[model samples]
Target: KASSSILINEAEPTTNIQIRLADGGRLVQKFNHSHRISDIRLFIVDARPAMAATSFVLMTTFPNKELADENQTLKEANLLNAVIVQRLT
Candidate 1:
C-alpha cells in the first residue's frame, strides 16, 4: 500500500461561513477573514435569487449577534473559524 499523507492546504486566513436562510436551506462558503459583512450579503442574494428579490439581514447564532456594520471584516467579527450564522428576511 502507498503511504497516504494528509496535507491540508494553507493559503490565506479564511473561515467557513454558513448562513441559515429563514426557511428550508442554507448558503455555505469560504470567506477570507478580510471579507466584509457587506460582501457576504452579495454572496447570499447572488447564490439565492429568492433572497435577492427581498430585503434581509445577517446575524450570529446562539448569542444572536447582528451584523450591522456594512464594512466590518470577518476577522474583526472574530469569525475566523467555522461560523454558523443566520439570515433574516
Candidate 2:
C-alpha cells in the first residue's frame, strides 16, 4: 500500500507541475514554471520553511509496512523533512 497526493505551486497550478518519486529515491518533480527544479535534483528541504509560501510542489509516497518503517526511522532520527507547500489562499 502507498499514499500519494497531488503537488501544487501557489504561484502556479497543479496541472503545471508533476512530482514523481521512485523507490529508494527522493521525490522527483517536473514543474512547468522554471528550471530551478530541473537543474538541482534530489534537493530535500524542511517540511516547514518560510520560503514555502505556497510556491513549492511536493508529493510524498510510502509502500505500506516497509515504507512506513522507513518513514518512522527517518522521523525518529530527526530526519523527517519534506518539501513544503503552503495553501494558495
Candidate 3:
C-alpha cells in the first residue's frame, strides 16, 4: 500500500539537541520541532547503550531548567539549538 500526505516527513525541519550524558559523554542529535519531549526521551534512552534501564532528566546546564512536561513539543518548549544535561548517577 502506498499513501502520501501534505507534509513531507523527510523534509521536516529539525532542531539541534546537545546532550551532556551522565556516562561522561556528550551527544549531538537532531529532532523535529513538533516532536514531544516524550519522544525526545525515547530517543535518548534508545541511543545510548544500557541507558534505558535507568531514568534520567533533561535540562539546561547553566541556569538549569528541567523539561518536566513530556506533553510539550520541542517548539512549544522554545528549544531551538537545545541543550540538555543528564547527571544519571
Candidate 4:
C-alpha cells in the first residue's frame, strides 16, 4: 500500500494602510503584502485623477521617512502595519 499527502501554500491576506494626502486628506486601503510601492501610487492616481502620478512621493510619518523604492513590496518596504503615509509634491 502507498500513501500520499498534499501541501498547500496560501498567500497572505490583504492589509489596510493609510495614505495621507497632501491636502491633509486620508485614504485607507487594503493591499497585499507582496504589492510594490508603485501600486500605491497608481491607486492614488486612480482615486484622484487631478494629481499626477510622477508629481508626488509617499513617506512614513512619526520619524518622517520616504519610501523611495517603488519596486519594493509592502513587507520588503517595512510598511505592513497601520502606518501613516505622507503624500508630498
Candidate 1, residue 36: lDDT: 57
* Candidate that beats the other on TM-score, 1 or 2, i.e. the better one: 1
> Per-residue lDDT for 29 in model 1?
62
Where does candidate 1 clash, by residue pair? none
State TM-scores per candidate.
0.52, 0.18, 0.50, 0.48
lDDT of each: 0.53, 0.29, 0.53, 0.54
The TM-score of predicted model 1 comes to 0.52
Clashes of each: 0, 0, 0, 0
Poorly placed runs, candidate 2 (over 4 Å): 1-9, 14-30, 36-38, 41-89
TM-score order of candidates, best first?
1, 3, 4, 2
For model 4, the superposed segments whose C-alpha errors exceed 4 Å read 1-15, 20-24, 53-55, 62-64
TM-score of 2: 0.18
Q: How far in Å is the alpha carbon of 53 misplaced in model 2?
A: 31
The Cα RMSD in angstroms, rounded to one decimal, for candidate 1 relative to the true structure is 9.2
Instruction: Please write out the lDDT profile of model 3 over residues 1-89, one tens digit for every residue.
Output: 11111122665666555555566866665555665555654565556576646665456554456545457665576544344454564
User: In candidate 1, how many clashes are counted?
Assistant: 0
Q: What is the lDDT of candidate 2?
A: 0.29
Q: Considering every candidate listed, which one attains the maximal TM-score?
A: 1
